[PDB]
Amino acid sequence: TPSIEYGLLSPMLIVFGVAIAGVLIEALAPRQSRYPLQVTLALGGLIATVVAVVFVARGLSGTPGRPAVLGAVVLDAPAVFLQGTIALVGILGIMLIAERQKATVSAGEARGLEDFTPQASAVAGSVAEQLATKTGVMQTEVFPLTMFAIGGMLLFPAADDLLTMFVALEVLSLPLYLLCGLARRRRLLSQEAALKYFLLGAFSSAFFIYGAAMLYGSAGTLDLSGIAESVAAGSGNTSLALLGVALLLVGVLFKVGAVPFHSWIPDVYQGAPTSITAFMAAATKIAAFGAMLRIFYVAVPALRDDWRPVLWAIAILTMVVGTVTAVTQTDVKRMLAYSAVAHSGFILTGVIAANPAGVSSTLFYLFAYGFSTLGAFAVVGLIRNAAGDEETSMAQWAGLGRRYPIVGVVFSLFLLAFAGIPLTSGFVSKFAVFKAAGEGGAIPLVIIGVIASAVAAYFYVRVIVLMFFTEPPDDAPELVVPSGLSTAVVTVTAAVTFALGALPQPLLDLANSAETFLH
């Protein structure tokens, strides 16, 4: 019989079982009790996942990783590190998702402070939507779907086979496609975002599977270890291998947001629910870059001389176009999305390093940046126009910091982390990736990313200018708490973003210990 390492799969199994249990709650639980259970089932579940991870991590203190399901899944140090990062980010994202309306005379608060329309199938602004809002109904199906996303995402770094990694890509993509279209406010934009994300993601996934086919043809094996053995031994075709690497790179780059594939990120981040947008921008990037790391440092290191240049052309672009485009942006959400494109480029610079320092720097970069992005988007979700819609217009943020100094300082901290100012986790993060690139002979990327960061500092700083140095307008937006969960998310995220800047050696030792994959 096939040996199954349940202990190693423990975090993944916990997450997927919790998702299935949440679907059961949706099925056979009364409406009034669905939300208390789901969130309780969800957050606790993720907490268990985190616990599982550390246990697995401790188990990995011996063998340098080990396959779990007869290949097709490998939990080595990078895999467990990324899984723990994704688990923490998912906990925070679900706490953001579970936020309900602050308070009202009627008890019909409907998970709206998290931007989720009470009835997604209901037409925007229709009498049915208004009645659903009044009755306080909520589609708790969000919590299962989100868990599934996390599930697939937890798998995506750990997938040691092309088939499993493709399945994980689809499993994480579909729930996100659905979630993009559930926004409570600006429903038309959210539905457009869902459609765009679905179309481009399906297109990219077709490319990903075609590349997997090409790699399988070249190497005659789907395990990444087998592909590496074949390409190194020269047994493969060596042209199908390169073509498959390119096509698979297309899919992963789309998932992370390289410039040739970035265009979806701005629209999707602007249109998707703010909580979903935050959780996405952090954890999906983490998972996609984990898979990319596995592909390049395990599956196909031998062809470094072949794919190294291509990534250069992308990384440069991702640093340039991602930043230069953000310069003229006037929407906070859109500006942050372009910032995410640029930070994908910065990650790719470390990935290009092709050295263990590259792996460690990328892992730390992903952790710190995922936290910073989650916090920034969570904060953005609180700036509410008079009508209640998120005042994403940057001009409307003028004097926001003066009205709300604490939230303003927190958002400025996140912005400076993105800009990579020292004493912020962002600087340690950028320094790690650029140092890894320099040690890897890619110091021209260090220079170009330095210039790109200088450019991006402008649009990171303009927000602070509006927020603090400008007098508030007459119709300036107002904060909405809206509950303890959102404040906890924001404070935890800011605390991490500051601690990893001041005192990064913690978790940097962890990143260093996870600089080696189970080749």
Partner: protein
């Protein structure tokens, strides 16, 4: 490496059909035509799978894609139209030429990258299909790929959840039952009982024709408002 001549003929005819079906899907101005062409392409690919020593895969292709393309045809009727002829005129300036160039270049580059591969040896699948193709597939799926097999259940659950969340209208939009619609005050009843029939004239008795009031004017109620007043 060279395949059987009969297999070569099968490939040529069936792959020509598949290529024409794909081209039709892309180019068929009628959406239903595109769905039919998609069905043809899927069936042709199934036949090719059968020719490539993948009987179960080909048959499953036929079954599942027959069902799926029929559902797509239903959704074409529901969302696009029964016989709507799309214009296909480039609405984005210069997008058509750019898309054609990009597709041609990508296909050319992919084919160039593929090059000659079977020249490096083409093992006969008979060794693996020995003992049954379906049995070999089962052995692989439930031993080597049981994890992906299980995750397909998560894919199914996510699909069902998405369909329910985005498409399943709830109580607030449930259409009134005939029983409910038969009681409103006095449902239709007191309200123009059955609405007046469309006018029946010599040379004209379609539902579009309006009935004639005693004053000689056309009765508005006689013809459903959806129809354009004519005939």
């Amino acid at each position: 490496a060279r395949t059987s001549t009969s297999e070569a003929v099968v490939f040529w005819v069936v792959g020509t059909v598949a290529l024409v079906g794909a081209i039709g899907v892309v180019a068929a101005r009628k959406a239903v035509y595109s769905a039919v062409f998609l069905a043809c392409t899927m069936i042709s690919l199934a036949v090719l799978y059968i020719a490539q020593d993948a009987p179960f895969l080909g048959v499953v292709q036929i079954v599942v894609y027959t069902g799926a393309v029929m559902m797509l045809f239903l959704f074409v009727l529901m969302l696009i139209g029964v016989d709507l002829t799309e214009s296909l005129v480039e609405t984005i300036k210069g997008h058509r030429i750019a898309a054609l160039i990009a597709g041609a270049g990508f296909g050319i580059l992919v084919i160039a990258g593929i090059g000659n591969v079977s020249v490096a040896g083409f093992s006969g699948l008979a060794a693996a299909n020995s003992g049954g193709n379906v049995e070999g597939l089962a052995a692989l799926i439930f031993t080597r790929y049981l994890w992906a097999f299980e995750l397909t259940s998560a894919l199914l659950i996510t699909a069902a959840l998405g369909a329910m969340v985005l498409a399943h209208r709830e109580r607030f939009e449930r259409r009134k039952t005939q029983r409910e619609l038969a009681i409103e005050r006095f449902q239709t009843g007191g309200h123009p009982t059955p609405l007046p029939n469309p006018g029946v004239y010599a040379r004209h008795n379609s539902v579009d024709v309006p009935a004639r009031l005693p004053d000689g004017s056309e009765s508005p109620l006689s013809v459903s408002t959806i129809l354009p007043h004519r005939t």
